[PDB]
Each structure stands twice: as structure tokens, then as C-alpha cells.
Design a protein around this motif. Structure first.
Motif, PDB file in Angstrom:
ATOM      1  N   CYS B  50       0.829  -1.182   0.000  1.00  0.00           N
ATOM      2  CA  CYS B  50       0.000   0.000   0.000  1.00  0.00           C
ATOM      3  C   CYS B  50       0.872   1.243   0.000  1.00  0.00           C
ATOM      4  CB  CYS B  50      -0.961  -0.012   1.153  1.00  0.00           C
ATOM      5  SG  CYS B  50      -2.427   0.802   0.635  1.00  0.00           S
ATOM      6  N   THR B  52       1.153   4.363   1.559  1.00  0.00           N
ATOM      7  CA  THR B  52       0.976   5.420   2.543  1.00  0.00           C
ATOM      8  C   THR B  52       1.797   6.687   2.402  1.00  0.00           C
ATOM      9  OG1 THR B  52       1.392   5.992   4.786  1.00  0.00           O
ATOM     10  CG2 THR B  52       2.671   4.215   3.821  1.00  0.00           C
ATOM     11  N   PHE B  56       5.186   8.451   7.423  1.00  0.00           N
ATOM     12  CA  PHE B  56       5.188   7.270   8.263  1.00  0.00           C
ATOM     13  C   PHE B  56       6.560   6.628   8.261  1.00  0.00           C
ATOM     14  CE2 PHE B  56       0.434   6.459   7.649  1.00  0.00           C
ATOM     15  CZ  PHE B  56       0.185   7.607   8.298  1.00  0.00           C
ATOM     16  N   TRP B  60       5.172   2.057  10.698  1.00  0.00           N
ATOM     17  CA  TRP B  60       3.760   2.080  10.415  1.00  0.00           C
ATOM     18  C   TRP B  60       3.446   1.420   9.099  1.00  0.00           C
ATOM     19  CZ3 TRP B  60       1.959   7.540  12.113  1.00  0.00           C
ATOM     20  CH2 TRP B  60       2.354   7.721  13.421  1.00  0.00           C
ATOM     21  N   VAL B  61       4.331   1.517   8.114  1.00  0.00           N
ATOM     22  CA  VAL B  61       4.028   0.885   6.842  1.00  0.00           C
ATOM     23  C   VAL B  61       3.804  -0.596   7.047  1.00  0.00           C
ATOM     24  CG1 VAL B  61       4.811   0.397   4.574  1.00  0.00           C
ATOM     25  CG2 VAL B  61       5.259   2.570   5.558  1.00  0.00           C
ATOM     26  N   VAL B  64       0.179  -0.605   8.525  1.00  0.00           N
ATOM     27  CA  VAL B  64      -0.921  -0.273   7.636  1.00  0.00           C
ATOM     28  C   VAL B  64      -1.038  -1.303   6.550  1.00  0.00           C
ATOM     29  CG1 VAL B  64       0.492   1.093   6.176  1.00  0.00           C
ATOM     30  CG2 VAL B  64      -1.892   1.505   6.220  1.00  0.00           C
ATOM     31  N   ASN B  65       0.055  -1.972   6.229  1.00  0.00           N
ATOM     32  CA  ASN B  65      -0.038  -3.075   5.300  1.00  0.00           C
ATOM     33  C   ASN B  65      -0.989  -4.141   5.834  1.00  0.00           C
ATOM     34  OD1 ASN B  65       0.838  -3.670   2.767  1.00  0.00           O
ATOM     35  ND2 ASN B  65       2.325  -5.152   3.533  1.00  0.00           N
ATOM     36  N   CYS B  68      -4.592  -2.949   6.477  1.00  0.00           N
ATOM     37  CA  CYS B  68      -5.341  -2.988   5.240  1.00  0.00           C
ATOM     38  C   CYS B  68      -5.751  -4.409   4.922  1.00  0.00           C
ATOM     39  CB  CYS B  68      -4.528  -2.412   4.096  1.00  0.00           C
ATOM     40  SG  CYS B  68      -5.560  -2.323   2.675  1.00  0.00           S
ATOM     41  N   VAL B 255      -6.049   4.985   1.709  1.00  0.00           N
ATOM     42  CA  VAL B 255      -4.753   4.806   1.075  1.00  0.00           C
ATOM     43  C   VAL B 255      -4.927   3.767  -0.005  1.00  0.00           C
ATOM     44  CG1 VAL B 255      -2.406   4.162   1.371  1.00  0.00           C
ATOM     45  CG2 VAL B 255      -3.586   5.248   3.218  1.00  0.00           C
ATOM     46  N   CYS B 257      -4.108   0.804  -2.391  1.00  0.00           N
ATOM     47  CA  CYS B 257      -3.184  -0.311  -2.352  1.00  0.00           C
ATOM     48  C   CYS B 257      -3.154  -0.990  -3.703  1.00  0.00           C
ATOM     49  CB  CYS B 257      -3.600  -1.332  -1.300  1.00  0.00           C
ATOM     50  SG  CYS B 257      -3.705  -0.756   0.402  1.00  0.00           S
TER      51      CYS B 257
END
Lengths: 360, 360, 360, 360, 360
Positions: B50, B52, B56, B60-61, B64-65, B68, B255, B257
Motif C-alpha cells: 500500500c 501510505t 510514516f 507504520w508501513v 498499515v499493510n 489494510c 490509502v 493499495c
């Protein structure tokens, strides 16, 4: 990385039992297409690399790489600017990644079908060859050895195998085959078609929107030194398209990507093309062969009749009737056995069967 | 990575002993669904990537991966803005990750059940085939070899195996089967149903809220060049939704993806769909076959009667009675043996049993 | 890395059965070209490294590396500036990466063809050698052992193998060969051609635009101490060309790359060149050999006649007729057997066949 | 890393069958040169490390490392400044990397040739030893065991093997050899030459521009404590030369590199030198041995005559004639057999052959 | 890392066939020196680490590390400053890295030579033991088993093996040995020398410029608690010297390095020293043993004469003559056989040979 798997090759590559000429090209086919099918989706384990400008933090690079790889890509020879809209930019459009690696899996599958057809159909006939082949086979393998049966050899065939087959005809010929030949020749036509369809799926691979290929055109271009971009075709360097979303909507841009694969795919497509269309032409002659066998059939008897042209001492029985009572399934399975077990023994077999055939 | 396991394949793929036609499709089925079931949850060991925004810190990546990947995702064709609320944004909603990889495990399990049913049920009948099959089998394998028994062969069958089976009928026929045929044909109906239910679980996979699929529609779209997003369906690029919590409450955002899997799943679903619905249609004809066997049953005798149509010298005993005393379980197991051991031997078997049958 | 695969070598390197002299050079050829073909595209698993100026963030370096590797490269001796346009810069142009690794795969394939030709063609003749070779072979292997047959040895040959072959001639000589010799010698010409074509594909490798090579010229340069760049040729250090796109259009520049491979390719090309052109010259003498056998043919009989020059006790039968009835296929297969099974036994074979030959 | 391959060693190191004294030094040679040839181009899997000043971003270091490794290097003892131009700087010039690793591959190849020569040539003679060796061999191995033949042993040799060989002479002596000895001694001269040429390729390795080496000079330097740089030769630390291109043209500079390899190469070159020149001197005495055998030849008979000096009971036949009819090929193959099978048995063999030799 | 190779050990460690006492110390020697030789140049796969001041960017550290490791190093006890020039700084100079790892390879090689000498020389004698050993050996192994030959055992030896050897003397004693004993005892002197030379190469290892070592001195220091630097010797921490080049010329400096290896080398050198000088002293007594055997030789006969001191029933033949005709080679090979095959059987052998010896 480096890895090599032999047993997977040897397994189908050998273990299914038949020597059948040039039908084993279905086998070796399935091998090549299978392997290349896999090794391509191996991703050379760097599918495609791209150029992105410099402020992306490298977790976007590992994105824009993929995003380029999925959403379409295209080409332009270089220096045209891009013009605008979608027209002149996206005219020359190359993505086959959605096709090659899987469509080959489908390929190999469709070369392995026709066998499965055959075994299923010949099983429908109720009279199995494979059993016979193994039986008479290791018969010959073993007894061939022993010195005892040579001058006796003929009578040996007379007793052990020959009756076995003949009985096979007794049980079988009652149930749903005089016709096995026609079943077979169906399988050979079906074969030839399948091959052709495969070829046409090559030429229609890439896409019928943007030209198509056949080998000595392409080679005869490369050998002309037409490179790739100055062919206008088979690009090695593309201009990828890309999006974001902000309050301003489409927000799109381009990043030019290097393309490694395209060096593979248009290294092999040539070779694979020759080799397929070969497999077609060699697989059709064998297709009509069994019609030219099936329609005529009076000169089909030739080889078999020819075996009774050695015929020690020629005891009594006539032939034309003898062929008549035998007309169909036997006439074939004889050719088969002579094919697998070779020439000399099957002679012994037939010359036995004629002799012991009485009541039938 | 690269790994290949043969012995796990060969184990079930062969070792359970039967040749039963097109019921082995339950086997090869379980193989395909099992493998693909696994290799998909292999995560191609990059499930989804994704986009972002840039502040970040990369821990965080790697969040958030996942986030998501678990909380839902969805799609929009691109340029509609998002509108607002939940309505127009989340209308077109694609998450099947909660389904595919496991529901296939369930699949393969439900193709392997019906066998287990069969062995259990035929064990209920008290009369086992498998023992018989192996017994008479290696009987034939060994003695077939030896030259001694050919002209004697018939009497050999008369003594050794034939009595063995017949006794099998003595012990068995006292306990809870004349009926084994009906047990079996139950297993074949049950089979056919199971297959169908599987198909319907495909079409109802994805979800009955958002359309459904069947192959040549989809292909006939792709071949129309309808791509994916401009199908509106089967998206490769999605807009993920995401939350935080601060003193301001929901605090949410989107975001977009990239989505790799969706290239797999809608590469295979086509193929797997053809191949299943095939397995259904070929598995139903075999289903009613045993009713058309079970109701009529007067023309069931055909093959068996046909074996007594070779019948060397035809000593005495009549048939219609002989079939009468044999009517049920034998009539079946004969077909079975002829199926496994092939055609020619079982003839020998029956033609023995008729002869030695006296007191019964 | 380090990896070594023996079984792949031993497999073709041995398992296909024949000792045929200097035709096994087709085998060992296919080995060398196959291996080097692979190990080169192994990328020494650093294909090429380049110099780029200092503000590229290292995700461009991993780009410009590839981009250099695909789009062309070239050379200049160093200090000429570059001049301008395309002329004086790109005159001396070296990219063979588009050629070597694959064109070798093609190579090995074309050395393995001629065998496949042979087996196919000799199978067309209807009379197989291989069966015979194995048969008479393990004949000799086993019975050689036993003490019993030595003084009896001759008669042993008389009975067991000799008749076997002779029958082989009976069945065969009816069907489509007296001619097998001509088939064979075709295969040897075809062989020799193939070799030559290979050589010429070397010298025409690199390109017919920029000179060409043959060994002792190049060595005789290196041994003159002409290094590489001061040969002007075989460069180890190149000046790569590169593009971007901005509103200013072509926007191009140069970056000089080190080149590792070129140390390999012009380490081996010498060796591989000697070894090929060798394989040619040794494979042609064997080519005309079978014409000088096929035209004359009156002194072909020599060796065979010479075997009947030992001839214990010389019973009766004359030769010239005896050779006459045997004239064609036998005359060959004799040479073959003597070649595989060695000298002494085949004498026994022939001296048997003459004796038992009567009716024919 | 750490890896060890035994089977590759055992394969050629043993499996080719002969014990031939000090000709196996061709074998063990090929081993050593092969291995060291490989392990050196293994790059100790840090080929060379260099010093570059501090503003290079480390993707230049990984460049200048290679670039140093390909473009030449050189040495100076340290403190001379560099002077200028090319003269005093590049006088003392050491790059052998372009030589060692490959020239050894060539080496081993040229030690394995002479065998291949031998087998080819002795195959030209038409009379094979190897068959004989194995035959008479396992003869002796088996029958040696059994108690039965000891007092009978002599007659056993008389019947089984002895006649076999003698026949070998019958068939062979008609075709193109009395001369096999001369063939052989050619192979031994050719051998000795090849060795010498190898030695000279050592001393001429490095280069005939900058001195050359032979062992106890170098050692006798090291043992004098002459180190390396203060030998002026065999440097371990060099000053690499390097270029860029900017609008100012050549733009060159120097960076001093540490050199690891040079500790290897001048660790082994000593050893390898002793061991080669050894292999020469031991391989020449064996070379003239067969001339001193071939010219004299009247005292060649010695050993053979000496076997008939045990000669139980000395029945009749004279020798001088007997040697006369045997003069050439036999006289040799006898020595061979006695060499492989050892001393005692071959006596039995000869003393048989004399006896049964009558008609010839 | 962790790796262990057994088969390489077992191979030479066993497979070469002999039990010869304390000569197998040549074997176990070659093992130890071989292994430690390797494992030391394994670099404990951190050869040496150094201190460099803080502005080097870490691609110099990975340099100065090597550069220290090649260019010399040295030691000073610490606090002397360095003084100046080269004198007081470089006085105490320790680099043996240029020696240990390779000089051990040379070591093991020179312990394995003397065997190769032996087999070569004993092969010169023309009379092989090894054949005999295996022959008489498995003789005894097999027939020992069977109950039949015990009371018959003696006569069994009389027939089968005993004559075999005796013939061995017939053929051999004609050709170039009565002398094999002297050959052997040469090999044992040569052995003892080689050992000594090895020892002296230890003590002269390190260097004859800076002292030398022998074990209980060093230990008797360590056990005195003299540590290392306060021995002044065997340093574990050194001051490396280093250069650059700028317009100011030599531009040199020092960096103190930790030294790991030196903990190994002076952990083992003790042990290896004991074990060598042991191998010397045990290998010399066995050296003069065969002179004290060779000069006297009248009391050599002892053991052999002693075997005829059991001598069932003592038929006739005298000894002194019998020893006379046997004097040389036999007298030895007897001792050998008794050594390998053990005591009891060889008695049987001799007591046979005396008996059957008649004509000689």
C-alpha cells in the motif's frame, strides 16, 4: 538461485509406458512448455525496474514497481514527446504478462489431454492393449534368454502367448469393438487439431489488436539488424503510467521502466515457435496415415500378409478367409505389438495364431 | 522460495488401491484443491502493498499493510472522487481473503469424504472386496507366469480362487447383505451431489451480494478486452480504508493499495471452474449408471451371461436358476473384479464358479 | 555460490548406449556447450557495473545498471573525447549479450539433433540394430564366462545368436531396406555439415559488421602483448549511453561502465574455437569414409572376407555368391557388431552365419 | 564458505581402469591442476581491496575495486614518488590475473590428452587390450579361489584364457599391427614432451618481459629473508591506476590497493613447480625406456624367456622360433598383463601359450 | 560455522591396507597435520582486528585490517614509547602467518611420501606382498570357518597357499631381489630422517632470527605464570604499521591490533610439539631395529626356527640348509605375514613350506 529437479522429469518423461513414435512428442512437449511456464513465473528467483524521481522514500519505489507491473505499460520510440490525451501515447501498448506464464500452463495441459483421451477411449473398447503388451512382452524377454526354446521357440509361442491373445479376441469381440481402429484414428485427428489450435494460439498470442508474429519474419528482422525499438516492436524499454489521488483528481504521471523479461520472451518465442509448428507438421502426417490405412485397408494387410511370406513349411490354412475372420481389432493390435516388441517376435506371434486358429 | 514435495503426492495419489474409473477424479481433485489451497496461503513465500503518505516511519508501513489486509478493502473506477458517507464509497466491495484459502481446504476434504463413506459402508456389508481383489489378484499375477497351467489353467481357477470367493458368499450372504449394490449406488448419488454442491459453492463464492461468476462469461469478457476496472469488476487496484484514534474520534482516511493476489485468483478461477463442472458432469453419468443398472437388472446380467457365451464344451448346468441363486452380491463383485483384474481372467473365474456350484 | 550436478552429466553422458567412435564427440560437445551456455547466463551467481555520478540515490544505480545492460553499449580507446552526433561515438559497438548465452543453447541442440535423426531413420529401415546389439551382446557376456562352451563355443554361436540375426534379415529384407548404408552415410554427411555450420556461426558470431575472429590471430595478438583496448578490440571498459525524459526531450548522457563478462567470453572463445574446428575436421574424415566405403564397396568386403581367412577347417561353401546374397544390410551390421562387441566375437558370428546359410 | 566434493575426485581418480605406473601421474596431475585451477577462480568464496579517498559514496568503491581488478596494476618499492609519464611508474608491472586461473584449466586438459591419444591409437591397432585385461583378469580372480584347479591350474590356463588371447592374435595380426609397440612408445615420447612444454609454460608464465622463476632461486631468496617488496619482486601491495572522463580528458589518478591473492599464488607456485618438474623427470625415464626396449629388443625377450626358465618338465617345443612367430604384439601384451595381473599368473599364461602353439 | 567430514577421514585413515605397527603413525600424523593445516586457514569461518582512529569511514577499516594482515606486524611491551627509526620499534617482530598454514600442508605431504616410496620400491623388487597378503589372508578367513579342515588343516595349507607363495619365490628370485630386506630398511631409515627433519622444521619455525621453542621451556614458563607480553614473547597484542601516499611521501603511522590467532597457535604448538618428537623417538627404534636385524641375521632366524620348534611329528628335512636355500626374501615375507595375519596361522604356513620344499 539455482535448483534442479530430476525425478519430476523422469517420472512422466519415462514411466508411462509406450514407445509410440512421435506421439512421445506430446510428452516432450508437455515437458518443455511445463518447465518454461514455471521458470518464467519464477521471476528469475527483479521482474521490472522503474525510474522514479528522487523524493520517493523507497517504500514507494517498492510500490510503484508493482503498480507499474500490474496496471498497463506501453512503449514509444524516442523522441516524440508524448502528445496528449490517451491516443498517441497508448497506441503502442505492450502487456503480455497477463498472458504468457499461465497460458503456457494451459498449453502443456492441452498437450497431455489427448493421451488421457486415448486411454479412456481404448478402455471403452473393453479390450486393453497394455496388459497384452506387458504380458507377451516379458514373455519374450524371459524365454528369449533360455537356450531351450529356439528350434522349439515357435511352438512355445504357439502355446503360451498366442492362445492368450486369441482368447482376448474371444471375450472382446463380443463387446463393442470391431471398431477400435476408428477410435484410434479419431485420437490421431483430435491430436493433430489440438496441435494446430496451439499454433494459432501462439500467433494470436500477443494480441490481434497489435500485429502478430511468425518466426523467420522476426528473425529475418533481427538478422537485418532491426534491433527492437527501431523495429518499433518488441520493446525493451517502456514508459509506465501511474496515478495518485488527491483533492485534484486523477493526478497522473509517467515513469520510464527498464524491462528485463522482454529479453527472455523474445529470446524463446522464436525457438518455441519453430518447435511447435514442427510438432504440428510431424503430427499431421501421422494423422492422415491412419485414414490412408482406414479407407484402403486392402493394402493395410500388407505387413501382416508379409509375415506369412516367411512361414516355415507352410502347413495348410489359407489366408483370405483367415484375414476375414480376423478383420478388425486383431489386424491393429498386431501392428501395435510389432511396434513395441519390435519386428522379429511379432512374426512368431502371428504365424502362431494363424496355425492354431481353427474353430473360430 | 522454491520447494517441491513428491512423496506427499505419490502417497495418496497412488497408494490407496483401486483403479476405479473416474472415481479417481475424486483423488486428483483432492490433489489440485489441496495444493492450490496451500500455495495460496503460502503468501508467495508481499501479500498486498500500500501507498501510505510519506511521513510514516516504516514501522507504520509494516502496520498499515496488515491493517489494510484484515479490515475490509474496496474498489472504485477512477475518477469519481469518493463521494461521502459509506454509501457510494463502499458499494463495490471486494474482500475474499477471508474465504479462498480456507474454503479450499474444506473443498478437498469434501471430495475425499465419499471414499471414506464407501469403505465404511462396504465394511458394514460384512463382505470385503479389497481382500478378494488382492487375493485373486496376485493369484493371477503369479500363476499367469508359470507355463504349467494353461491347458490346466481353467481347473486351476476351479480349485484355488473360485472356491475362496464362493465361500465368501457363504459366510457373507448370511449377514446383512443381499443389498450391497444399493449401498454402492447410494455412494455414487452422494458423490454426484457432493460435486454439485461444490460447484454451487464456487458460484456462491465471492458473495451473493455482489454478482457471481461462470467461466465463458468472464473469459468472453476478457476476450472482449474488457480488462478489469473497466469491467467494473475483478479489480487489481483498490482504495483501502484506515483509522486512528485521537481525542477526535474516528479519524479515518484512505490509502490506495496495489493488489497482487487478484491476478492469481482470477487467473485460476476460470480454470478451476471448467475443471470442477467437468468433474460434475462426468461424475453424474456414472451416478445414474448404477440406477439404470439397479432398476432394470434383467439386462444387467448381460456381461455375465456373455461370459458363459464362450464356455468351453458347455458341460451341463443351466443359468437362469444359476443366476437366481447368485442374484445379488456376486453379480456385482464379478463386475468389480473384471474391472480391476481386467477382462480375460474374470471370465475364467465365473466359468469356474458356475461349474463348481452344486449344493447351494 | 557453489553447486555441482553429476547425475545430469552422467545421464546423457553415458546412458544412451553406443560406443561409436568420435560420434560421441556429438555427446561431449552437447555437454560443453550446454554447461557453458548455462553457467554464463548464471550471471556468476554483478553482470556489469557502472560509474554513475554521485547524486543518484542508489535506487537509480540499481536501475542505470540494468538500463546499461540492455540498451546498447560501446567502446572508444581513451583519449579521443567523444566527438558528437552518433557517428564517431558509436562506430565501435560491442553488445553480444543479446547473443552468446542463448545462441549456445541453440548450439548444443543442433549437435544433439543428428543422433535423433539417426535413430529415427534407422527406425524407418524397419531393421533395428539396438535390439540386436544388446541381444548378441549379453549373449557373449554370459556364455563367455562358462567353461563349457569353448571347443563347443563355435557351435553355440551357430545355434543361438546367429540364427536370430539371420532371421532378422529375413523379416527385414522384405521391407524397405537393402539401402540402410546409404541412410547412414547420409547421417554422416549431415553430421559434418552441421558441424561446419556451427563453426561459421562462431566466426559470424559477434557480427559481420565489426570484423570477426579466428583463434591464432587473436592469440597471436595477445601473445604479441596487444592487450585489448590497444588492440582497439575486445574491450574490457566501455562507455554506456543513457537517457531521461523531461520537457527537454532526449536528455542523454554517458557513464563509463566496467565490464566483467568480457574477461570470460574472450577467455573461452579461443578454447571453444579450437575445440569446435577440431570437432569439424575429425568429423569430416569419418564423413567421406563411408562414401569411400559406399562407392568402391568391392574392397569394403575386405574385413568380412578377412574373417573367413581364419575359418577353421573350411568346410565347403564358397563366398562370392555368399557375399552376393548378403550384399547390403548384413555387410553393414557386421561392421557395427564388430565395432561394439569388439573384434574376436563377431568373427565367430560371421563364420557361423556363412555355415548355416543354405536355403536363402 | 566450505564445500568438499568426493565423488568428482573418485570418478576419474579411480574409475578409468589401469594401474600403469607413473602414468597415473597424468591422472593425479590433472587432479591437482584442476582443483587449484577452480579454487583460485573461486575468489575465496574479496579478490582485491583498494584504498579510495573518502568522498566516494561506496557505490564507487564497489566500482573502483573491479576497475582496478581489470585494468592493469603495478608496483613500486616505497619511497620513490612516482616520477611521471608512463615510464618509471609502469616499469614494474604485475598482472597475471589474466592468466593463472584459466591457463591452469588448459594445463589439466593437456595432461589428460595423452591418455585419450593412447586409447584412440591402440584402438587403431584393432587389437584391444582392455577387453583382454578384464577377461583373463576375472578369470584369475574367480578360479584362483576354487580349490579344484591347482595341480590342474596349469591345464586350466591352457584351455580357457590362453586360447582366447591366441585367437586374439589370429584376428588381429591380419589387420594393421605388428607395430603396436611403436605406437605405444610414440605415446610415451609425446607424453614426455607434453610434460616439458608444461614446465616451460610455467617459467614463461608471468611474462618473458619481466624476469621468470625457478624454485630454489625464489625459496633461496625467501630463506635469505628477502621478503617481497625488498626483493623488488612478488609484490603484495600495489598502486592501482584509474581514470574518469570529464571535459578535461584523461583525468587520471592512483589508489594503492592491498593484494591478497599474491599471497596464494606465490605460496603455491613453489610447490607446483617442484611437483611438475618432478613429473617431467620421472616421466622421461619411462619415455626412453621403451626405445631402449624398442631398438635392442634382443634383451627385450629377457623376462619372457625367463618365464620359460621355470617351465615344469619342459616338454618339447623350442623357443627362438617360438619367439620368432610371436615376435611383435604378443611380446608386448605379455608385459602388459604381467603388469596389471601381477607376476605369478602371467607366467602360467605364457607357459600355456608356448605349449598349445602348433599350427601357427 | 560448523561442519564435519567423516568420509575423508575414514578414506585414507583406513582404506589403504596394512596394520604395520607405528608406521600407521605416518597415517595418523598426516591426518592431524592435514586437518589443523586446513582449519587454521579456515580463518575460523575475523583473522585480526585493529583499532583505527575514528574518522575512517569503515571502508578503510576493512582495508587497514587486511593491510595490517599482510605487511608485517610487530610487538613491544608496553610503556616504552616507540623510540624512532626502525631499530627499537621493529626489533621484536612477529609474523608467522606467511608460514604456518601452508608449511603444515607441506608437513603432511612429507609424512605421506615415505609410504609411496615403499610401495614404489617394493614394486621394483618385482615380488609384491599385497597380493600375497590378501590371498593367503582370505584363504585363512574362509577355510578357518569350515569344520572340515582342522585335523586336515595342515595339509590344506600344504596344498593351497603354501605352493602359491613358494612359486612366488620361484618367479621372483630370478628377478632383482634377494635384497628386499635392504630396500625395506632403507625405507625405515628414510622414514626416521624425515621425522627428524620435521622436528627441526618446527624448532626452526618461527625464525632463527628470533629465538626458538621447545615445549617444557614454554610450558615451564606459562606454568611459572609468565603470561605472554611479560615473557616478552608470544604476543597477543601488537602494534601494526601502516602507510599512505600523499605529496608528502612515506606518511606512515601505527595502529595497535588485537590478535586472535596467536591464542590458537600457541595453544597447539605445545601439543603438536610433544606429539611430533614422540613420533620421532618411536619411529627411530623401529629404524635401527631392522639394521640390528640386517647385520646379525643369525639370530634373525629365531622366530622362524622357533616355529619349527612345534613341528608335529618332525618328519625329516633338516633346517640349516633349508634356511640356506630360503635365506633372503622369504625370511622377510614370513615375518610380514605373521604380522598381518597374526601368529598362529603363519606357523602353519612355514611348517608347510619346509615340508613341500624338495627340488629347489
Amino acid at each position: 538461485a539455482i535448483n534442479s529437479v530430476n525425478a519430476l522429469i523422469s517420472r512422466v518423461f519415462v514411466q508411462p509406458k509406450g514407445d509410440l513414435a512421435d506421439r512421445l512428442n506430446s510428452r516432450v512437449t508437455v515437458v518443455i512448455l511445463a518447465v518454461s511456464s514455471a521458470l518464467l513465473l519464477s521471476s528469475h528467483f527483479d521482474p521490472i525496474t522503474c525510474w522514479t524521481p528522487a523524493q520517493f522514500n523507497a517504500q514507494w519505489v517498492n510500490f510503484v514497481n508493482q503498480y507499474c507491473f500490474v496496471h498497463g505499460t506501453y512503449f514509444v520510440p524516442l523522441d516524440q514527446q508524448l502528445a496528449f490525451e490517451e491516443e498517441e501515447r497508448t497506441k503502442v501498448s505492450i502487456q503480455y504478462y497477463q498472458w504468457v506464464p499461465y497460458v503456457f500452463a494451459l498449453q502443456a495441459f492441452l498437450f497431455y489431454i489427448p493421451r488421457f483421451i486415448w486411454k479412456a477411449m481404448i478402455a471403452y473398447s473393453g479390450y486393453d492393449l497394455a496388459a497384452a503388451v506387458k504380458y507377451v512382452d516379458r514373455f519374450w524377454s524371459e524365454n528369449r534368454d533360455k537356450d531351450d526354446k529356439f528350434k522349439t521357440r515357435l511352438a512355445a509361442f504357439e502355446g503360451r502367448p498366442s492362445v492368450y491373445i486369441w482368447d482376448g479376441i474371444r471375450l472382446a469381440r463380443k463387446k463393442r469393438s470391431r471398431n477400435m481402429a476408428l477410435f484410434y484414428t479419431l485420437s490421431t485427428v483430435w491430436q493433430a487439431v489440438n496441435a494446430w489450435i496451439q499454433f494459432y494460439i501462439l500467433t494470436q498470442l500477443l494480441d490481434s489488436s497489435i500485429y502478430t508474429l511468425w518466426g523467420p519474419s522476426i528473425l529475418g528482422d533481427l538478422l537485418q539488424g532491426n534491433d527492437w525499438q527501431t523495429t518499433g516492436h518488441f520493446p525493451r524499454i517502456v514508459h509506465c503510467d501511474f496515478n495518485r489521488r488527491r483533492p485534484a483528481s486523477v493526478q497522473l504521471d509517467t515513469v520510464l521502466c527498464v524491462l528485463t523479461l522482454n529479453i527472455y520472451y523474445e529470446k524463446l518465442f522464436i525457438f518455441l515457435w519453430f518447435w511447435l509448428v514442427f510438432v504440428a507438421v510431424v503430427s499431421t502426417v501421422n494423422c492422415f496415415k491412419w485414414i490412408y490405412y482406414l479407407c484402403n485397408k486392402t493394402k493395410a494387410q500388407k505387413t501382416i500378409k508379409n509375415y506369412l511370406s516367411t512361414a516355415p513349411i507352410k502347413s495348410t490354412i489359407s489366408d483370405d478367409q483367415f484375414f476375414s475372420a480376423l478383420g478388425e481389432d486383431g489386424l491393429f493390435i498386431m501392428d501395435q505389438m510389432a511396434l513395441n516388441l519390435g519386428d522379429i517376435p511379432a512374426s512368431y506371434l502371428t504365424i502362431s495364431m494363424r496355425n492354431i486358429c481353427q474353430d473360430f
